[PDB]
Scaffold this active site. Structure first.
Site, PDB file in Angstrom:
ATOM      1  N   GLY A 178     -68.648  -9.667  27.734  1.00  0.00           N
ATOM      2  CA  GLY A 178     -68.084  -9.055  26.854  1.00  0.00           C
ATOM      3  C   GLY A 178     -66.687  -9.106  26.347  1.00  0.00           C
ATOM      4  O   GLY A 178     -66.040 -10.066  26.470  1.00  0.00           O
TER       5      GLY A 178
ATOM      6  N   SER B 143     -61.351 -10.911  26.271  1.00  0.00           N
ATOM      7  CA  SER B 143     -62.379 -11.342  26.490  1.00  0.00           C
ATOM      8  C   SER B 143     -62.603 -11.390  28.285  1.00  0.00           C
ATOM      9  O   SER B 143     -61.606 -11.499  28.806  1.00  0.00           O
ATOM     10  CB  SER B 143     -62.684 -12.646  26.197  1.00  0.00           C
ATOM     11  OG  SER B 143     -62.584 -12.843  24.643  1.00  0.00           O
ATOM     12  N   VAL B 144     -63.971 -10.810  28.607  1.00  0.00           N
ATOM     13  CA  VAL B 144     -64.351 -10.848  29.841  1.00  0.00           C
ATOM     14  C   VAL B 144     -65.346 -11.790  30.314  1.00  0.00           C
ATOM     15  O   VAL B 144     -66.600 -11.712  29.757  1.00  0.00           O
ATOM     16  CB  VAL B 144     -64.543  -9.364  30.257  1.00  0.00           C
ATOM     17  CG1 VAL B 144     -64.770  -9.176  31.733  1.00  0.00           C
ATOM     18  CG2 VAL B 144     -63.530  -8.434  30.003  1.00  0.00           C
TER      19      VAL B 144
ATOM     20  N   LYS C  27     -60.545 -11.110  33.282  1.00  0.00           N
ATOM     21  CA  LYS C  27     -60.075 -10.839  31.807  1.00  0.00           C
ATOM     22  C   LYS C  27     -58.919 -11.397  31.370  1.00  0.00           C
ATOM     23  O   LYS C  27     -58.061 -11.732  31.825  1.00  0.00           O
ATOM     24  CB  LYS C  27     -59.977  -9.237  31.559  1.00  0.00           C
ATOM     25  CG  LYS C  27     -59.271  -8.720  30.160  1.00  0.00           C
ATOM     26  CD  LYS C  27     -59.545  -7.558  30.152  1.00  0.00           C
ATOM     27  CE  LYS C  27     -58.169  -6.868  30.425  1.00  0.00           C
ATOM     28  NZ  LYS C  27     -57.791  -5.363  30.406  1.00  0.00           N
TER      29      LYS C  27
ATOM     30  N   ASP D 298     -60.070   2.024  33.620  1.00  0.00           N
ATOM     31  CA  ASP D 298     -59.773   2.011  31.964  1.00  0.00           C
ATOM     32  C   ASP D 298     -58.966   3.133  31.954  1.00  0.00           C
ATOM     33  O   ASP D 298     -59.215   4.011  30.821  1.00  0.00           O
ATOM     34  CB  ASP D 298     -60.998   2.119  31.165  1.00  0.00           C
ATOM     35  CG  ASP D 298     -61.548   0.916  30.929  1.00  0.00           C
ATOM     36  OD1 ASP D 298     -61.462  -0.128  31.606  1.00  0.00           O
ATOM     37  OD2 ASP D 298     -62.494   0.781  30.150  1.00  0.00           O
TER      38      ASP D 298
HETATM   39 MG   LIG Z   1     -63.897   2.073  29.059  1.00  0.00          MG
END
Ligand SMILES: [Mg+2]
Ligand SMILES: CC(=O)c1cccc(NC(=O)N2CCOCC2)c1
Ligand SMILES: [Cl-]
Ligand SMILES: [Cl-]
Ligand SMILES: [Cl-]
Ligand SMILES: [Cl-]
Ligand SMILES: [Cl-]
Length: 346
Positions: free
Chosen positions: A27, A31-32, A47, A162
């Site tokens: 995703g 970018s990951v 990442k 996050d």
């Molecule tokens: Mg999140």
């Protein structure tokens, strides 16, 4: 210096050390890819940051994220496994790659589709508060706790991820959106200078949803959500009204009919009485009066799990850079030094 190899995956060049194999897009701030790390045996997330030094704002955000991830060393918080650049000097430095443990399910994938006992709710909320005691002891505010930012495994073990990097836009917080349902009222409507207490409001909203299986305050917009909040906890008294700095925000609150706090045993029907008691201590409108993470760990609801010799605090964290005025290339030099000084965990 390791040997690097190059490949194109979905329109993007990836240049990474040979230790990382079988890269596959998962995703997309960047970018990951999922990969297998041959040095450690772990499945990892890699990442690649997008446009990390494109403006002063972006260069400072890149430095902020790398400083925060390098600091966090706790069982209930995401940590940094690696950071790398294919650049051989500051002069050719342009790309940053961050490596963490690959996360599977989030709290959304278990609260939507699974039957939770009171014992599951005790263990999940215990772990969030153990991680928050650590984060708050470094004077870090998470600012975005919600189910999608909490990773959970098969053994019900939890990690916070996050962190709020001062990111979210006005569009992102508008209307019927989960991005606003867990936010404290004082930050949702800019009432005052906020502090770490905003994270305890979010834990209250999460704990209520694990007990009922339903969002606590699913507002259709900021004003609808405030009306749902005040119907549960009651309208503000004169003491909190004095602490709201915006005169217009004070005038708006004073336009609403006064309402008393509701009986939480009649809202959370059949819950453990000790769960009801802890929710009444988190979901307090005046942020000065909310329970702290350290105080909550000692609450009788967690008697089965609480161990005051296994609830660690963080090393001191210097955030003086946050008030500093620098040029793009100065922020980029500071970031380069942090990439080259990284030491991997055991
Ligand atoms: Mg999140
Ligand atoms: C264990 C627990 O606390 C629990 C479990 C399921 C549902 C609820 N409460 C509600 O869904 N309510 C009740 C009255 O208010 C509107 C709907 C509580
Ligand atoms: Cl390698
Ligand atoms: Cl981790
Ligand atoms: Cl580079
Ligand atoms: Cl969410
Ligand atoms: Cl520091």
């Amino acid at each position: 210096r390791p040997t690097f190899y190059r490949q194109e995956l979905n329109k993007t060049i990836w240049e990474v050390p040979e230790r990382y194999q079988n890269l596959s897009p998962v995703g997309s701030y960047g970018s990951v890819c999922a990969a297998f790390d041959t040095k450690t045996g772990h499945r990892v997330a890699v990442k690649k940051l997008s446009r990390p030094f494109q403006s002063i704002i972006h260069a400072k955000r890149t430095y902020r994220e790398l400083r925060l991830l390098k600091h966090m060393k706790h069982e209930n918080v995401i940590g940094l496994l690696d950071v790398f650049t294919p650049a051989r000097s500051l002069e050719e430095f342009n790309d940053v790659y961050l490596v963490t443990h690959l996360m599977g399910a989030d709290l959304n994938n278990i609260v939507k589709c699974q039957k939770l006992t009171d014992d599951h709710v005790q263990f999940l909320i215990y772990q969030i508060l153990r991680g928050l005691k650590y984060i708050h002891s470094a004077d870090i505010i998470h600012r975005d706790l919600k189910p999608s930012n909490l990773a959970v495994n098969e053994d019900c073990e939890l990690k916070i991820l996050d962190f709020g990097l001062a990111r979210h836009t006005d569009d992102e917080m508008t209307g019927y959106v989960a991005t606003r349902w867990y936010r404290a009222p004082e930050i949702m409507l800019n009432w005052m200078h906020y502090n770490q207490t905003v994270d305890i409001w979010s834990v209250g909203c999460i704990m209520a949803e694990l007990l009922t299986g339903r969002t606590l305050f699913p507002g259709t917009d900021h004003i609808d959500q405030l009306k749902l909040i005040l119907r549960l906890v009651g309208t503000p008294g004169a003491e909190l009204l004095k602490k709201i700095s915006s005169e217009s925000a004070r005038n708006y609150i004073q336009s609403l009919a006064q309402m008393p706090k509701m009986n939480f045993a009649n809202v959370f029907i059949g819950a453990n009485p000790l769960a009801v008691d802890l929710l009444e201590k988190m979901l307090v409108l005046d942020s000065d009066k909310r329970i702290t993470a350290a105080q909550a760990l000692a609450h009788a609801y967690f008697a089965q799990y609480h161990d005051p010799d296994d609830e660690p605090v963080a090393d001191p964290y210097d955030q003086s850079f946050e008030s500093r005025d620098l040029l793009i290339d100065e922020w980029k030099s500071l970031t380069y030094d942090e990439v080259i000084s990284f030491v991997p965990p055991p």
